[PDB]
Amino acid sequence: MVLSEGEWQLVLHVWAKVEADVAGHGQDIFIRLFKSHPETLEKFDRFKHLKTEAEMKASEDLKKHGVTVLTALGAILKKKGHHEAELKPLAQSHATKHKIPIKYLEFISEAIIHVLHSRHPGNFGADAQGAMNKALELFRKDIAAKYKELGYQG
Ligand code: HEM
Structure with missing residues (x-):
C-alpha cells in the first residue's frame, strides 16, 4: 500500500498533538490495551503483576515504556513509508525475544485509534482516522513481512 501526502498530513497533524503529552498518551494506550x-x-513479565487500572496508572515503569513505544512509532510515522531501517530492529526483537503475534499489533492499533478519537475529536474526524488506520495497516503489513523473513510470521 501507499499513502498519499494528504493522508500523511492527516496522520502527522494529529501526531503533533499527541507529542504535546507523550507520557499521558502512552499511559492511556497501554491501559486501554490491557x-x-x-x-x-x-x-510483559515486567507488568504482569499489575492487577487494576489504579495500579497501571501509578506505575512509573509502565509510563516510561509507553514513552519508548510512542517515540519509536512516532519515528516510523515521520518517515512517511520509508521506514525499512527503523522496522528491522523492532521486528527482530518482537518476533524473536518478545514473540508478539501480529494479532496483538492489531490490538494496540485499535487502542491507539480509540485514544486519539477520545482526546482529539477535532483533529480526528473520519478522514483523519481512515488515514491513521492506513498508516498502521502499512506498519503491520511491513512488520508481518519481516516476521516471515526472520522465521516467525505469526
Ligand atoms: C506500535 C507497536 C509497538 C511498538 C512501536 C513497540 C516498540 C517497542 C520498543 C521500542 C521496545 C524496546 C526495545 C525492543 O525490545 O525492541 C519494546 C519492547 C517490548 N515490547 Fe513492544 N512495541 C509495540 C507493540 C508491542 C505489543 C502489542 C506487545 C505485547 C502485547 C509488545 C511487547 C513488548 C515487550 C514484552 C517488550 C519488552 C518489555 C521489557 O521487558 O522491557 N510490544 N516495544
Whole structure:
C-alpha cells in the first residue's frame, strides 16, 4: 500500500498533538490495551503483576515504556513509508525475544485509534482516522513481512 501526502498530513497533524503529552498518551494506550485484551499483559513479565487500572496508572515503569513505544512509532510515522531501517530492529526483537503475534499489533492499533478519537475529536474526524488506520495497516503489513523473513510470521 501507499499513502498519499494528504493522508500523511492527516496522520502527522494529529501526531503533533499527541507529542504535546507523550507520557499521558502512552499511559492511556497501554491501559486501554490491557483492559480490553488482558491476554496481552501476559507478554510483559515486567507488568504482569499489575492487577487494576489504579495500579497501571501509578506505575512509573509502565509510563516510561509507553514513552519508548510512542517515540519509536512516532519515528516510523515521520518517515512517511520509508521506514525499512527503523522496522528491522523492532521486528527482530518482537518476533524473536518478545514473540508478539501480529494479532496483538492489531490490538494496540485499535487502542491507539480509540485514544486519539477520545482526546482529539477535532483533529480526528473520519478522514483523519481512515488515514491513521492506513498508516498502521502499512506498519503491520511491513512488520508481518519481516516476521516471515526472520522465521516467525505469526
Ligand atoms: C506500535 C507497536 C509497538 C511498538 C512501536 C513497540 C516498540 C517497542 C520498543 C521500542 C521496545 C524496546 C526495545 C525492543 O525490545 O525492541 C519494546 C519492547 C517490548 N515490547 Fe513492544 N512495541 C509495540 C507493540 C508491542 C505489543 C502489542 C506487545 C505485547 C502485547 C509488545 C511487547 C513488548 C515487550 C514484552 C517488550 C519488552 C518489555 C521489557 O521487558 O522491557 N510490544 N516495544
